[PDB]
Amino acid sequence: EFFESMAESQICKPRLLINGPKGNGQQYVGAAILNYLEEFNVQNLDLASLVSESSRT
Amino acid sequence: NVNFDDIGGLDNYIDQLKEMVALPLLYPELYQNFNITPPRGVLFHGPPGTGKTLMARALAASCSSDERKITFFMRKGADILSKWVGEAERQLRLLFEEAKKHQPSIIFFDEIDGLAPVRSSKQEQIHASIVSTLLALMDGMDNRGQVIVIGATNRPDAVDPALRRPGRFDREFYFPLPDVKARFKILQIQTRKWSSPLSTNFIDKLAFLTKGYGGADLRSLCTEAALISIQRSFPQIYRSNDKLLVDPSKIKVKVSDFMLALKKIVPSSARSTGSSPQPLPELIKPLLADQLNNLKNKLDYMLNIKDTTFQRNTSLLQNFIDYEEYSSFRSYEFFESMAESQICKPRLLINGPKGNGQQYVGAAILNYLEEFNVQNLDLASLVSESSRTIEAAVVQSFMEAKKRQPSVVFIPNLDIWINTIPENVILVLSGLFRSLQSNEKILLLCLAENLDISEVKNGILSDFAFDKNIFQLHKPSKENITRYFSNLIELLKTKPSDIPMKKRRVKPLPELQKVKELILTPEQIKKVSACLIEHCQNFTVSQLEDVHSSVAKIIWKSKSAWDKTGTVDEIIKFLS
Amino acid sequence: VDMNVNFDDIGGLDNYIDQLKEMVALPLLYPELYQNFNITPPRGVLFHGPPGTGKTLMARALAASCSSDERKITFFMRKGADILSKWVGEAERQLRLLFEEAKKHQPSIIFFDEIDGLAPVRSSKQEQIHASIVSTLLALMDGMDNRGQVIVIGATNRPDAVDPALRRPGRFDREFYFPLPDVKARFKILQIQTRKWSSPLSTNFIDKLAFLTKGYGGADLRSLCTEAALISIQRSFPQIYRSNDKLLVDPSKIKVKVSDFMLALKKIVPSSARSTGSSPQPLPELIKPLLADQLNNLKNKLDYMLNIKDTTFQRNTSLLQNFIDYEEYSSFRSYEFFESMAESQICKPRLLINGPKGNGQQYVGAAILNYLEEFNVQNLDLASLVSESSRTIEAAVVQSFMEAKKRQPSVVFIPNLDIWINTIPENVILVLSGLFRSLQSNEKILLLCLAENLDISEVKNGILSDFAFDKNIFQLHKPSKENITRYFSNLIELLKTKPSDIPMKKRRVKPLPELQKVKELILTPEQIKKVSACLIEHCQNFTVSQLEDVHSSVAKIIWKSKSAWDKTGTVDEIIKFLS
Amino acid sequence: GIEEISTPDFIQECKATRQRDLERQELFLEDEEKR
Numbered sequence A: 001e002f003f004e005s006m007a008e009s010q011i012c013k014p015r016l017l018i019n020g021p022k023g024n025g026q027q028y029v030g031a032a033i034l035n036y037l038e039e040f041n042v043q044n045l046d047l048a049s050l051v052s053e054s055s056r057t
Numbered sequence B: 001n002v003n004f005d006d007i008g009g010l011d012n013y014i015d016q017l018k019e020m021v022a023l024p025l026l027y028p029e030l031y032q033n034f035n036i037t038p039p040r041g042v043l044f045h046g047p048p049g050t051g052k053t054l055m056a057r058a059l060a061a062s063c064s065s066d067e068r069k070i071t072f073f074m075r076k077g078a079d080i081l082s083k084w085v086g087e088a089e090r091q092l093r094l095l096f097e098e099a100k101k102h103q104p105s106i107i108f109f110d111e112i113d114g115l116a117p118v119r120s121s122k123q124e125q126i127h128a129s130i131v132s133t134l135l136a137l138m139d140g141m142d143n144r145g146q147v148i149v150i151g152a153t154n155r156p157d158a159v160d161p162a163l164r165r166p167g168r169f170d171r172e173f174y175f176p177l178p179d180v181k182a183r184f185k186i187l188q189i190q191t192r193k194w195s196s197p198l199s200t201n202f203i204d205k206l207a208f209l210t211k212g213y214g215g216a217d218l219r220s221l222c223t224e225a226a227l228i229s230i231q232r233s234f235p236q237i238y239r240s241n242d243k244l245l246v247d248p249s250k251i252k253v254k255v256s257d258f259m260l261a262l263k264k265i266v267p268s269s270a271r272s273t274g275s276s277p278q279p280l281p282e283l284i285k286p287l288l289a290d291q292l293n294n295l296k297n298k299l300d301y302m303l304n305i306k307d308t309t310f311q312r313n314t315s316l317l318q319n320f321i322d323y324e325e326y327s328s329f330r331s332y333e334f335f336e337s338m339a340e341s342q343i344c345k346p347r348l349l350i351n352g353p354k355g356n357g358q359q360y361v362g363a364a365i366l367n368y369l370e371e372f373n374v375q376n377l378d379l380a381s382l383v384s385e386s387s388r389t390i391e392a393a394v395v396q397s398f399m400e401a402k403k404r405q406p407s408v409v410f411i412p413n414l415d416i417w418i419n420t421i422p423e424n425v426i427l428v429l430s431g432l433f434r435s436l437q438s439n440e441k442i443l444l445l446c447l448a449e450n451l452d453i454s455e456v457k458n459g460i461l462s463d464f465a466f467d468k469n470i471f472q473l474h475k476p477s478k479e480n481i482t483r484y485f486s487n488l489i490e491l492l493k494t495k496p497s498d499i500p501m502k503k504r505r506v507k508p509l510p511e512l513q514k515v516k517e518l519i520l521t522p523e524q525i526k527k528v529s530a531c532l533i534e535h536c537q538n539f540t541v542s543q544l545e546d547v548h549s550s551v552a553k554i555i556w557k558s559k560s561a562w563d564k565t566g567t568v569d570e571i572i573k574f575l576s
Numbered sequence C: 001v002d003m004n005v006n007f008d009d010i011g012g013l014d015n016y017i018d019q020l021k022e023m024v025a026l027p028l029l030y031p032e033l034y035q036n037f038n039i040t041p042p043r044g045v046l047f048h049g050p051p052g053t054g055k056t057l058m059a060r061a062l063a064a065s066c067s068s069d070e071r072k073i074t075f076f077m078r079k080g081a082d083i084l085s086k087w088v089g090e091a092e093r094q095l096r097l098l099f100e101e102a103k104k105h106q107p108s109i110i111f112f113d114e115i116d117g118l119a120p121v122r123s124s125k126q127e128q129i130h131a132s133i134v135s136t137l138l139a140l141m142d143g144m145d146n147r148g149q150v151i152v153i154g155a156t157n158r159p160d161a162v163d164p165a166l167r168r169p170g171r172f173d174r175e176f177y178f179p180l181p182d183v184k185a186r187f188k189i190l191q192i193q194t195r196k197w198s199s200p201l202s203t204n205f206i207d208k209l210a211f212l213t214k215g216y217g218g219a220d221l222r223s224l225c226t227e228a229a230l231i232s233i234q235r236s237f238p239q240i241y242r243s244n245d246k247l248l249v250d251p252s253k254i255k256v257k258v259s260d261f262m263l264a265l266k267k268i269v270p271s272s273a274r275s276t277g278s279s280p281q282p283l284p285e286l287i288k289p290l291l292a293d294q295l296n297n298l299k300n301k302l303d304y305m306l307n308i309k310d311t312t313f314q315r316n317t318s319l320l321q322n323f324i325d326y327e328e329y330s331s332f333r334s335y336e337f338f339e340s341m342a343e344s345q346i347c348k349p350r351l352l353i354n355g356p357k358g359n360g361q362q363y364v365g366a367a368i369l370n371y372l373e374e375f376n377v378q379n380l381d382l383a384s385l386v387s388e389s390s391r392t393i394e395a396a397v398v399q400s401f402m403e404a405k406k407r408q409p410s411v412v413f414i415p416n417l418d419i420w421i422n423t424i425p426e427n428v429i430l431v432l433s434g435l436f437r438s439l440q441s442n443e444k445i446l447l448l449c450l451a452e453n454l455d456i457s458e459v460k461n462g463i464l465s466d467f468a469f470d471k472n473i474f475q476l477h478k479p480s481k482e483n484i485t486r487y488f489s490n491l492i493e494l495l496k497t498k499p500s501d502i503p504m505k506k507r508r509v510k511p512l513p514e515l516q517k518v519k520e521l522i523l524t525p526e527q528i529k530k531v532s533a534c535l536i537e538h539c540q541n542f543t544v545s546q547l548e549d550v551h552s553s554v555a556k557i558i559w560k561s562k563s564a565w566d567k568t569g570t571v572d573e574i575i576k577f578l579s
Numbered sequence D: 001g002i003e004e005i006s007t008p009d010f011i012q013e014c015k016a017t018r019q020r021d022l023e024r025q026e027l028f029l030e031d032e033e034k035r
């Protein structure tokens, strides 16, 4: 109960914002990161995935 | 089969379901004497995996299946409706004639919200016909026979309100996610047919660890822990392609297998949105216990949780077993008029700065109020279902809070909820709370981050009576930060012989038969604690957890070192 | 499901029993009177009302009560659209065979329970599978050939879901509204359900139960009596709930007491509480000192507004008993003139109750709706408008007003008018005002609006000016000194009680028998006067909500020390709280 | 035609008497072997 709680305390609020000038290779950086985190479960929240299904808002 | 001793908790419902299945058949002269009929139809409702189908199967195959056999028909609501235009009504009629000819019978409609939903959408007219034939078929007040209709659902407002009336489903039973005693009973039921049964202190710690679990999740936990014990005690039977390496039972499911099953099994209360009701975690507890208890004291004052000596609601059959009875008229209605006169208007607004652990305080308060009917008016709880409007969902949640009378209308993140929820349904909720009587036990619990009081006395929440009932979560004190930063020190002072690392075995796995002191002065510990408290000056819980995580990474990175001077120097270098 | 239930089993529907005898039994006995005028008897009634009112009971009692002679009446019964299958064929063919077998056994009653699923309204899509059933039903009910003595009864919750071609003479010429029963009919239902019992209840206890069960239907009263009997079985013989073998009990000394009904009233939620509007109920016994001085005035105002206590015309509870007990006595100048001058007393019934914020309006509205017992309450509050997610606001307001236009003694009820005129859209108030000005004067649709701190400038030259709230504004003033004195006198009567009077339950000294299987209270009267003076002086110019706050805060202190005999500490804590 | 004769109410009645007549033919074969 001590070591599992100090091992799970190493993630606090995992956030990241990559911000550069217009056209500075963001569409490649995002794909390379999502390939690097291939063990995760990626939930895309872009516009092409939300407005695709017409039943759900 | 399943009998009543396979059900953990739910003893009130076991005693209340025996007066409409068992006792009508067993004692037919004590029900004919009063010219009464058993209620004949129950709506089970609750989270998935709580024991509704188990209760129906126990009620079928437990109440005297010896000469007066009770048959059991299990149907799903999505099974009855088909792709045609007349199949569902005829199939319902066939099921009810088949249950009428086998006269003591129990029909069980699992997930009846699919068969008979609420009338707010869905044209092409067939669901009105299915609902009408269902309403006309389960007439329990014209002696159709001895059919008992049991309908299971997640929340009872997803069922058509015409079915929640006398004659149809009379009684509604809430099947909750089990508390610590019921989880103890469930884990004792699941670990009773084992060969090496667990102790009492084992099942107590398993019941304390399994927060937010149901019955099915505890069953999968026990099954997966047993599978890990077979996978660990005799691991040679997997990779070896040979024949039976037969092995006796020296297997014992210890702590290190349940601790892996706990992280391999996800609960069904980790799928519902909002704050899952659970106590404060063991890390943040010294930051938030002292302000939680005051809230509990406030909730013990305005709700009468401790001095509920007139409302001790258990199975009242047990009250008639263990107590006895007692002008004689006045002592009922006068003291029941002054006993319900203690609840006046239960309101509470927990309001602190941003990131001050409100998502933990809400879950801890909802864990304190387990015997209440929590109705969550969270954003993701209303905008998820597309079958209802925000208006109708808020009104139906309030009405389910009004029917089941000890209830909590819980609005997490009120500062967002007054911006992304329109003013129409806020004024609707205001008018619904204003039409309540004062002696009604509907607590309005709202938790807000950095809300202005001008919205509380002059704004849109001015007609909710949050005038004296505002509790202020403040940032934790220095004596609380000093105790919160006292597991990093006890991780700085553990020598690497106690850190449970992995070391390879020098000898291979056998096969069966073929039939120092760590260098850390107390001045360094004192200087680490002093700089770690001096950095966290007037901080919130989120910033304290950020500092705790960023120091724990530095400590756990150098976890095999025996001289902690570099780790202490890196800790002071980060906090500067 | 066609038992021996007759007409003495139904209570409070004595007017429709006469008409059902008029159209089922009396043509069989007397065919010479019906053939004297060349009239066919009316055949086919649509029963409609709230659920749990007695429609199926009336159908079964009509089938069994008129067949007590040797003139048998077969009772064909159909559940609501159980007759249609996955193919196109049997839905019309089974109705054909049903009407043919009803033609064969000539005195017959076909009972369509839940006919709103069998004959629905013609929608935009999915036309075929119900219109092909409505067509054969309409052509079989009032076809060219004589149907015979087949009395068609339908039953529904709402009649608008049935097709309008069915609601027509020859098929459904009579439409019977079964109302949620009043206090005399609830008395009679409670007397009927507790009739077979071995130890019967008293008359005044059934009267007090009839007053306590406001909002209950007939099915709710049956469920109440059933749960009272079950709690009596649990109280007398608990040990049958623990054994799995049939123990030997005796069906005596199991008499139902008052304490079983008082728990059954808590276990039973009626169909009034399942609705989303304001449930009509009397003033609770705590706040009845605070409000019943100024509720009674409202009653007097309503007695001058709706002519409740002046009922000489339109007293039609039962026309046949009216023809039995009373006696008849130019033609226009003795009937039509006096009917016009009796109907011309209701001019435009409106009432706006307007008090300060928290002055007990949620109690006054429910008490007025309890007083208007013979009226049809249509709640135009926000929750009932937005609860049906398929409807719009405008359609719900128009539907509620059109439901109030029929069953003409009706009340359109808008609680929280200050919220209503701020959160309903502005065109809906104009729709409702146009519906109210397109009424005749002599129509008894009362507009009852309750508001909290509403400005008179909004009803003078605002958005409520087109409702004629001119003289009909009643002001709920704050409660005076004597009402607060009586309220806190009941609180003091709680304080000066003994711990032997406070009901604590028991711990039984002996277990239940197994069954054969087959000090002095020290409280000076000066301290009572000090506590009463402090409660009076603290609650100066308070509303009902602040008075209930002080009452709850002092009742908690009193129920803290409910066992202590030295009541000086609780008096000191009470005086310390009000400072 | 037999798609019209085979209707699910008669089908469930015929499965009831089908298990009855399965049991009947079993008892009758053992009866004609024992007698």
Ligand SMILES: Nc1ncnc2c1ncn2[C@@H]1O[C@H](COP(=O)(O)OP(=O)(O)O)[C@@H](O)[C@H]1O
Residues within 6 Å of the ligand: B006, B007, B008, B009, B010, B047, B048, B049, B050, B051, B052, B053, B054, B055, B152, B186, B189, B214, B215, B216, B219
């Ligand atoms: N209260 C309980 N006590 C003991 N076992 C339970 C309980 N609730 C669930 N279970 C376990 O979960 C299973 C029942 O799941 P199910 O009845 O389908 O849940 P639901 O009806 O909520 O979908 C059973 O196999 C049983 O072992």
Ligand SMILES: Nc1ncnc2c1ncn2[C@@H]1O[C@H](COP(=O)(O)OP(=O)(O)O)[C@@H](O)[C@H]1O
Residues within 6 Å of the ligand: B141, B142, B167, C009, C010, C011, C012, C013, C050, C051, C052, C053, C054, C055, C056, C057, C181, C189, C192, C217, C218, C219, C220, C222
């Ligand atoms: N007016 C009444 N008088 C006497 N009993 C009634 C009355 N209304 C209802 N009941 C009781 O309620 C039970 C159920 O009524 P029900 O037929 O379900 O009405 P509905 O079909 O309108 O819901 C009946 O068995 C009857 O005993």
